[PDB]
Amino acid sequence: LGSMEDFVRQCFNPMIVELAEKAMKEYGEDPKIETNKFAAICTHLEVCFMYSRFEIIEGRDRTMAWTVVNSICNTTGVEKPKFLPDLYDYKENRFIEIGVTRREVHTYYLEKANKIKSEKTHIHIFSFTGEEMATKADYTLDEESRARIKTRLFTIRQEMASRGLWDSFRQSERG
Ligand SMILES: [Mn+2]
Ligand SMILES: [Mn+2]
């Protein structure tokens, strides 16, 4: 049984580890203790950066994110989201909320949708199974582009498994 804080650090992007290290410290969660959530954050992030037409919101400091949201919201006449999407899509002129779950796709979706009280925020969910779900059957990206996202979650799962780490990860998610 390996060290997740190891695997995370030596299996994600430096960039990605330290944006998520830094995302965590901001809620006073230690990456050394909260290592399963540490990886999850890194993965969720990695995905958002592969779904990139698209402006990125996840990853920025909250000050920077909220300003980013606002110039768009001021320039397009788009409703302000209450919370913070992950991306914006210039082609469909909408904000997108990205979700990566190790649970039920349907459960995670409705949890997302009911949080954000979206009218216009689009919601794309993937899991480590292929299983996915986008708001209104609107998959935004082309079967290929989504497929590469699918492949890599798979390459995350087994590489965890190689170290006895997959098992726990799998079962430790909540809402
Ligand atoms: Mn986000
Ligand atoms: Mn998200």
Curated annotation (Swiss-Prot):
Purpose: Plays an essential role in viral RNA transcription and replication by forming the heterotrimeric polymerase complex together with PB1 and PB2 subunits. The complex transcribes viral mRNAs by using a unique mechanism called cap-snatching. It consists in the hijacking and cleavage of host capped pre-mRNAs. These short capped RNAs are then used as primers for viral mRNAs. The PB2 subunit is responsible for the binding of the 5' cap of cellular pre-mRNAs which are subsequently cleaved after 10-13 nucleotides by the PA subunit that carries the endonuclease activity.
Q: How is it modified after translation?
A: Phosphorylated on serines and threonines by host kinases, including human casein kinase II.
What stretch of the whole protein does this chain cover? 1 to 197 of 716
How does this protein assemble? Influenza RNA polymerase is composed of three subunits: PB1, PB2 and PA. Interacts (via C-terminus) with PB1 (via N-terminus).
Residues reported in the UniProt entry to bind Mn(2+) 2: 58, 86
Q: What is this protein called?
A: Polymerase acidic protein
Write out the annotated subcellular location.
Host cytoplasm; Host nucleus
Q: Please name the GO terms that the record assigns under molecular function.
A: endonuclease activity; metal ion binding; RNA binding
Q: Which gene encodes it?
A: PA
A single Gene Ontology CC annotation of this entry is: host cell cytoplasm
Would the keyword Nucleotidyltransferase turn up in this protein's UniProt record?
A: no
Q: Which organism is it from?
A: Influenza A virus (strain A/Goose/Guangdong/1/1996 H5N1 genotype Gs/Gd)
Q: Which residues bind Mn(2+) 1?
A: 44, 86, 97-98
The similarity comment for this entry is: Belongs to the influenza viruses PA family.
Q: What are the recorded Gene Ontology BP terms?
A: cap snatching; DNA-templated transcription; symbiont-mediated suppression of host gene expression; symbiont-mediated suppression of host mRNA transcription via inhibition of RNA polymerase II activity; viral RNA genome replication; viral translational frameshifting
Q: What is the lineage of its organism?
A: Viruses, Riboviria, Orthornavirae, Negarnaviricota, Polyploviricotina
